[PDB]
Structure 1
Amino acid sequence: APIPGVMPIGNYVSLYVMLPLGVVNADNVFPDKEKVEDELKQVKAGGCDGVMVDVWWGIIEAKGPKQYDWSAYRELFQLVKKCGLKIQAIMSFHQCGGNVGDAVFIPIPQWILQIGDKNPDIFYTNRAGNRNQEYLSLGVDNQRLFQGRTALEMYRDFMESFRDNMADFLKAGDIVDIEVGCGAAGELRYPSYPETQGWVFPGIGEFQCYDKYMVADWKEAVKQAGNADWEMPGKGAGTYNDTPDKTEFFRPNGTYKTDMGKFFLTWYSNKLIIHGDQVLEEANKVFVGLRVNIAAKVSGIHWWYNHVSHAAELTAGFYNVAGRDGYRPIARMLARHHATLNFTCLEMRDSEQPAEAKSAPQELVQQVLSSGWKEYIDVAGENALPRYDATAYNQMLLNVRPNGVNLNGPPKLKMSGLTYLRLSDDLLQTDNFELFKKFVKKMHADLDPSSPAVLERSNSAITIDELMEATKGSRPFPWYDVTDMPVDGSNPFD
């Protein structure tokens, strides 16, 4: 039996904090060096293991193609090192903010947006013809439109430049994770719930497959399945803020359940997966044989999960319904590249959401973490919304270790890390920040604060039908109903 008081170190979960947005501003200038420096001293003294920061494409490659300026990020990194903190870098090929109620606006490079003025089908496009500038459509991954480059090649070249200009932080072990942005907000999904077009929680969202590049691919696919005349969904899909039952496409027994609907949803979600696969392949080509994790971010679309149609997951690109697991195919694709699944909605409870939203974040988390662990990959996480209270910290604590601590060794089920949203003035406010220091100590399983594996070369390409073998629905791992280590110091199993 174990010795009383001895906690095996395998129980430890690393805790990272997200830096403020704009910490390197749109001009490629790192301001408030002295203030930022003191926030980092506090974070380090709170016990955090590191921080996460966006590496914005539209800052670094702003001036033109292959004109990369890393100087400001090099400074920021040197500082984070000197404060004793690890670094998670997001390859952020997307836009930050740009609204009225927004800290900062960092678009993708200006010269890419020029191309878009004359050719707006480089952007994900809804049924009505609206273009979202946040991210380049997967439609354009392999289209040589960008001053003689394709979109995948721009992502490779930027990553190569990052590796080569950060080779010392990388060999020192200062950078531990590269999150590869695969979409809006850096997430592998379609922009189906865009605030810029009127979306409001808990709308069903809308499909984003109507750019001419993606429509060409569709016309071809649908012909080869023996039905030339099958259109992408129309008015039957409804619009962003509909309810499933008010549509033909998502109502019980709606179009989503017909042969046409399945075919379309299979294609739509397969394109997302293929995009993820091609982007992480470049990442793996670049970072092979370095001691660094690569990661992709998956959004938690928890609204309408208790509806049969799972409508908001579907518009987002996750073809997850009864008897079809939509997350396990993605985890399998990730496993081919030895990458980590970062799930970005860990803190929520079902009882905190309105009943008409048919929302099930707890069950959603359990499905995705389970499916990731079953494909032999690591799963890290983040909170979706800023939260300062005990209930939220205890729910994150449950999810990082869903069967609690193991006094005989590494736990059965453990998350690889948690990145907290966000470093801010509200977080450093004395009371808030005292609770946060208890949460970190609990994340560390009452050990004191303290490396990744060498990244293997991507395994063999999995063909599309071997990936569909992964949609076989299965039972998820059993979860505890409360944490082992709540923030109040107590133990619910005396």
Structure 2
Amino acid sequence: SNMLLNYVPVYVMLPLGVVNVDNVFEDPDGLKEQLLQLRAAGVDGVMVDVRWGIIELKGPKQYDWRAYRSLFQLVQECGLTLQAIMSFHQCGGNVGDIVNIPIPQWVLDIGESNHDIFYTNRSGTRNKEYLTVGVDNEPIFHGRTAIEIYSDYMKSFRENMSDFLESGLIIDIEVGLGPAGELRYPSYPQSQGWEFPGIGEFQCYDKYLKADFKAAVARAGHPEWELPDDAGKYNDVPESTGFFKSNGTYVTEKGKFFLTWYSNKLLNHGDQILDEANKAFLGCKVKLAIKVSGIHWWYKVENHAAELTAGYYNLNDRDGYRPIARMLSRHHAILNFTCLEMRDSEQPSDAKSGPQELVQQVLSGGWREDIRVAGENALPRYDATAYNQIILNARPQGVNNNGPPKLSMFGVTYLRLSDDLLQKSNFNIFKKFVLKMHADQDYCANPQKYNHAITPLKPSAPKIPIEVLLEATKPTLPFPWLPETDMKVDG
């Protein structure tokens, strides 16, 4: 019985490029300084993207883990733990982007001969940042399927990093399941002209997905059903489209079928890849996790358009997140969310943005399914208002004086370590943030003290059929949220 049980761990994301495109750890001295400053603040750990485009660049199964081993070594020396992301997606590539790392060139070479390995929009544009879920089990990559690539990659990682895993440095494995490493479709690509708060576009037009859907509708008794042709374009508003307008196609039988099939692909995609993750890190003292995208625009209108095109079939009469949480259950994985710092009043009224409500829904759905939920801030913020909102979401019902809190997130990762953050005035408030997150307790080196002891990863539990998974779509009332935290940074 002690306040320490209200302790929520805080991690800081490392900047991009720590390890460059040439697989070189370019600035150990500069990073060490920064890591030590993070120690002065009592930060628990850091998060780093382990880029597939950097590691398996040479060719199939030709991995080079040295640079990352050096990075891990430095982190361990500075006394911090680490969350490793298996990033099977592109980095940068947009005008102005400094850190640009596409997926392996040998995979792109295959893409030149088979354009359908990339997510595709209705106009036929190919998004080269990730491999379409449609080729998860297609053995077209020099004999391997997309999932086998991800599987061998994670297996190589565990073996070559066996020492860091056994010494307790690497404490979390976040499996990237799509663009930006999120489990979703690239519905709002900056490269194709999208601009907030556009509804975005469906990305199921590649030959593979377009064939599965057609077989699906045929089995449903409607062979003639086609992929959406009235959903408009990236920057449209819901009401201007035949698909999302009131009494539009989205509440139609065919529309509902399509949306169900569309969102279903994401559930199977994540479930199958997580199967490989459990096998790869079996026995290791590490937790598994995935990242869910926070599509807060249009959440306040009945059609939830942005979410739908992203692949989250979430409406006011259909929960599109609780099923994801349920799917994570058998893998004992953490649902890592975002938008933890946003307040509705900060978004433009024309965006119908409901980040606060989205967070409350996702988190409640996770706790309802009895899985752990973690999260990050969506955008760089250095003010007390952002921190207090994060702290609120961390322990939505406040702290329990002599016992664990009624509700609490498993941990939060702060967006990007940067010169701005380390700036004295900004770092001063950030430090108050860590203190409150830690419930006024000093940094605690042994997670066991606040009930975060990590045990050997167990095999994933029996597969759960899609019907049982979809039972979670039943709407539920969210847990009650406090209007403001009881533990705010005095600022």
Q: Which TM-score tier does this pair reach, normalised by the shorter chain? A: over 0.9
Distance 1:381 1:435 in 2: 20
Structure 1: which amino acid aligns with 2:282? V
- Report deviation, 1:44: 1.0
| 1:350 aligned residue | 344
- Matched residue of 1:407: which SS? coil
> Are 1:481 and 2:476 matched, yes or no?
no
The amino acid across from 1:464 in the alignment is I
Mapped to 1, the partners of 2:41 and 2:233 lie a distance apart of 45
How many residue pairs align between the two structures? 483
Give CA deviations for 1:26-69 in whole Å, capped at 9, x if unaligned. Answer: 00000111111100110111110010000000100000000000
Deviation of 1:470 after TM superposition, in Å, equals: 0.9
Distance 2:310 2:239 in 1: 18
Identity percentage of aligned residues: 70
Q: Does 1:390 align with 2:384?
A: yes
| Alpha-carbon distance between aligned partners in 2 of 1:416 and 1:21, rounded to the nearest angstrom | 25
**Is the aligned partner of 1:64 residue 2:69?**
no
Matches within 5 A, 1:54-453: 54-234=49-229, 236-450=230-444, 451-453=453-455
CA distance in structure 1 between the partners assigned to 2:10 and 2:185 by the alignment = 28
- SS of structure 2 residue aligned to 1:252: coil
Q: Distance in 1 between matches of 2:311 and 2:270?
A: 12
Name whichever of 407-416 and 72-81 sits farther off: 407-416
Secondary structure of 1:90's counterpart equals strand
Q: Give the letter aligned to residue 50 of structure 2.
A: V
Deviation at 1:453, TM superposition (A): 3.0
Q: Partner amino acid for 2:160?
A: N
In the alignment, which residue of structure 2 is the partner of 1:50? 45
Shift of 1:408: 2.7
Matched, 1:462 2:476: no
Deviation at 1:228, TM superposition (A): 0.4
**SS of structure 1 residue aligned to 2:84:** strand
Alpha-carbon deviation of 1:187? 0.3
* Cα displacement string for residues 275-315 of structure 1 (whole angstroms, at most 9, x for unaligned residues): 01011110011112221110000011110011100000000
Structure 2 SS opposite 1:106: coil
In structure 2, distance between residues paired with 1:103 and 1:80: 24
Contact between 2:3 and 2:439, CA under 8 Å: does it hold in 1?
Answer: no
Give the aligned residue type for 1:371. G
Q: 1:28, 1:60 within 8 Å by CA — same for their partners in 2? A: yes
Alpha-carbon shift at residue 425 of structure 1 (Å):
0.7
Unaligned segments of structure 1, at least 5 residues: 490-494
C-alpha separation in 1, matches of 2:202 and 2:244: 12
Letter aligned with residue 463 of structure 2: A
TM-fit CA distance, 1:255: 0.4
Contact 1:122–1:211 (CA under 8 A) maintained in structure 2: yes
Preserved CA contact (<8 Å) 1:8 1:406: yes
Judge conservation of contact 1:205–1:239 (CA < 8 Å) in 2: yes
Specify the SS of the correspondent of 1:89: strand
Q: Deviations over 1:68-122 (max 9, x none)?
A: 0000000000000000000000000001102222120011101001001111100
* Inter-partner Cα distance in structure 2 for 1:458 and 1:169: 23
Q: Contact (CA 8 Å) 1:21, 1:103: kept in 2 or not?
A: no
User: TM-score of the superposition, structure 2-length normalised?
Assistant: 0.97
Residue identity opposite 1:452 in structure 2: I
Take 2:97 and 2:136, find their aligned partners in 1: how far apart are those partners? 29
SS at match of 2:265: helix
SS at match of 1:97: coil
Secondary structure of the residue aligned to 1:182 is coil
Is the contact made by 1:291 and 1:454 (CA closer than 8 Å) also made in structure 2?
A: yes
Residue type matched to 2:386 in 1? A
Task: Give the deviation of 1:8 after TM superposition.
Answer: 2.0
For 2:144, what is the secondary structure of its paired residue? coil
Match of 2:449 in 1: none
Three-state SS of the structure 2 residue aligned to 1:176 is: strand
Q: For residue 239 of structure 1, give the secondary structure of its aligned residue in structure 2.
A: coil
Is 1:16 equivalent to 2:11 in the alignment? yes
- Amino acid paired to 1:175: I
Rounded to whole Å, the distance in 2 between the matches of 1:45 and 1:245 is 51
Return the letter of the residue paired with 1:385.
L
* Shift in Å, 1:237: 0.3
1:492 corresponds in structure 2 to: none
Aligned partners of 1:27 and 1:87: how far apart in 2?
22
Q: Is the 8 A contact 1:15 1:418 kept in 2?
A: yes
Q: RMSD of the alignment, in Å?
A: 0.9
- After the TM superposition, which of the residue ranges 135-144 and 407-416 deviates more from structure 2? 407-416
Specify the SS of the correspondent of 2:441: coil
* TM-score, normalised by the number of residues in structure 1: 0.97
Q: Give the Å deviation of 1:345.
A: 1.8
- Partners of 2:282 and 2:22 in 1: how far apart? 32
Contact preservation (8 Å) 1:299, 1:345: no
